[PDB]
Each structure stands twice: as structure tokens, then as C-alpha cells.
Structure 1
Amino acid sequence: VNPTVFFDIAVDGEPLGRVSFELFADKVPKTAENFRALSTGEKGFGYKGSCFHRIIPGFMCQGGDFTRHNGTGGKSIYGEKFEDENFILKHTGPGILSMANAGPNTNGSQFFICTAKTEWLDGKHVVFGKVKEGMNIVEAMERFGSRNGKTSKKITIADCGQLE
């Protein structure tokens, strides 16, 4: 069965709520496994304690840099970077979970959650999951973003792990 992972989001240390994701291990197993493992922290590093460094209202929320914490870092469980698995899934609407990158075959740990349909990204970013529960929490996170993506408050992943 496709795994389920959760993020407990905090704003300036205050609990905001929980967002759960279904990871499409059936279509993009390598990419899904990377995100799952980084969520549990089983490899010794991962998302817990990292922040969402770029939030653009009406577009997406981006995070995952747990190494440099300034938007340029992150790494995968397979090494520094890994290849684009496939582009079977599309950015069809709000709740889509997809990989950020710096060009072809540069996936690390950074990801983004879409809050709208984003067709232009199809074929450039690997879609590997979707919000299962807590879309209202993602919508609340958008309130702290801006055009440039800079956040007004510190939005962190206070806790994370695998549910199912």
C-alpha cells in the first residue's frame, strides 16, 4: 500500500496543525521512498526541524533544505542528487506534492506543495504524492507568504513521520 507520512507544522514555535500525504510508491517508487525516509529520519537526517523557505500565495509552498537552511541545500538518501524518475503524473491542482530541482536530474530533498494547477511545471518536476488531510493547514501557511516568497513568520516542520 502507498505509504502515508505526516508533517506537524509550527509557526514561530506555535502548533498550526497536521498535514498528511499519500506517496505514490506505485508510480514513482524511488522518489516516494526518498521522501518517506527523510520524513522518518531513519537515515540520520531529514525534514524534522527544517522550514518552508519560499511560500508564494496562489502558487506553492517550498521546503526541504535541512543542510544549509537558506534554500540552496538538501540531499537525498541515495547521495547528493538523483535522477528524474519519470514524468507520468501531472500537476493537476491543489495538494500535489512535487520535487524542486536545479535542472534535469538534480533531485535532492527540496519539494513543493501546489495550491493551484500548475501546468507549466509538467515534464520539469517529478510529481510523487498528494495531500491526504490538512489542506486547510497548507492554505493557512499561504497567509505568511509574499510575491517573492519570503515568509513573514518562521514556518517549520516541528515533527514528521510515517503513519501508514
Structure 2
Amino acid sequence: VNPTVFFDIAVDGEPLGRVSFELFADKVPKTAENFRALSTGEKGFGYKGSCFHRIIPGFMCQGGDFTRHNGTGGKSIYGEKFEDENFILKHTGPGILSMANAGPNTNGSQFFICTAKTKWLDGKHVVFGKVKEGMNIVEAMERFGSRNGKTSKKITIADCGQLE
């Protein structure tokens, strides 16, 4: 069974609700595992308490920089970076979960949640999951963003883990 993970989202510290994700371990096991383990915190580091530092309405919500909280950091469970596993899956619509990067084979911890189909990213960012529940939470988050990604309230992962 593909694992399920959740983020409990807060807005200026006040709980908004839960976003749940299916991770496509059946297609991208290494990429899924990274995200899974970062969500449980089981390596001693990960997404709990981190923020969505770049929210761009009509595009996506980006987060996962748990070391510098601004897009300059993050690390994977394998090292600073790891290779693009495959590009089997496409950015088909809202809810798609995909890895942020700045070049080939530079996956770390940063990720984004699409709020639209983002076809031009196909073959460039590794898709590895999708929102299962709480897309309404992601749509709510998206309203706090701007063209450059600056948010108007602090959007945090107050808690996260694996559902089972």
C-alpha cells in the first residue's frame, strides 16, 4: 500500500486543518521514502514546525526548507541532495506533490503542492504524491500568497506524520 502522510496546517499559529497525501511509492519509492521520513521526523529532522515560504496563487504552495526557512536550505534523508528518480508522473492538476529543485539531480527536502495543472514542469520536477484529503486547506493557504511567493500570514506545518 502507498503510504499516507499528513500535515496539520496552522495560520499565524492557529490550527486551520489537516492536509493528507498519498505518496506514490509504487512508482517513485526513493522520493516517496524521503518525504515520508521527513514527515515522521524519524531521522531526527524534518518538516514539523517548518513553513510554506513561497505561495504563488494559481500555481503552487512551496515548503520543506526546514533548515533555513526561506528556500536556501533543506536536506534529504540521503544527503544534501539526491538524483531525479524518474519522470513517470505528470503535473496533472491541483493537489499534485512534486519536488522543488534548481537543476538536474538536486532534490533535497523542498517540495510544492500544485494548485493548478503545471504542464511545463513535466520532466523537470519529480512528481511523487497527491493530496488525498484537505485540498480545501491548500486552497485556503493559497490565498495568503503573492506573485513572488511572500505570504501575508505565517503558514506552518504545526504537526505532521504518517497515517496508518
Same fold by TM (over 0.5)?
yes
TM-score category, normalised to shorter length = over 0.9
Count of residues in correspondence between the two structures:
164
Q: Please, which runs of 5 or more residues in structure 2 have no aligned partner?
A: none
Deviation at 1:105, TM superposition (A): 0.2
Deviation at 1:102, TM superposition (A): 1.1
Deviation at 1:118, TM superposition (A): 0.5
Residue equivalent to 1:18: 18
Residue equivalent to 2:105: 105
Q: In structure 2, the residue corresponding to 1:123 is in which secondary structure?
A: coil
Question: What TM-score does the superposition give when structure 1 sets the normalisation length?
Answer: 0.99
Q: In structure 2, the residue corresponding to 1:144 is in which secondary structure?
A: coil
Question: What TM-score does the superposition give when structure 2 sets the normalisation length?
Answer: 0.99
Cα distance per residue 1:7-59 (max 9 Å; x no partner): 00000000011000000000000000000000000000000000000000010
1:95 and 1:34 mapped to 2: Cα distance? Answer: 19
Deviation at 1:101, TM superposition (A): 0.5
2:13 and 2:82 mapped to 1: Cα distance? Answer: 33
Q: Please, which runs of 5 or more residues in structure 1 have no aligned partner?
A: none
Residue equivalent to 2:48: 48
Deviation at 1:122, TM superposition (A): 0.2
2:70 and 2:119 mapped to 1: Cα distance? Answer: 27
Cα RMSD, aligned residues only? 0.4
- % same residue: 99
1:162 and 1:118 mapped to 2: Cα distance? Answer: 27
1:65 and 1:152 mapped to 2: Cα distance? Answer: 18
Q: In structure 2, the residue corresponding to 1:7 is in which secondary structure?
A: strand
2:133 and 2:160 mapped to 1: Cα distance? Answer: 14
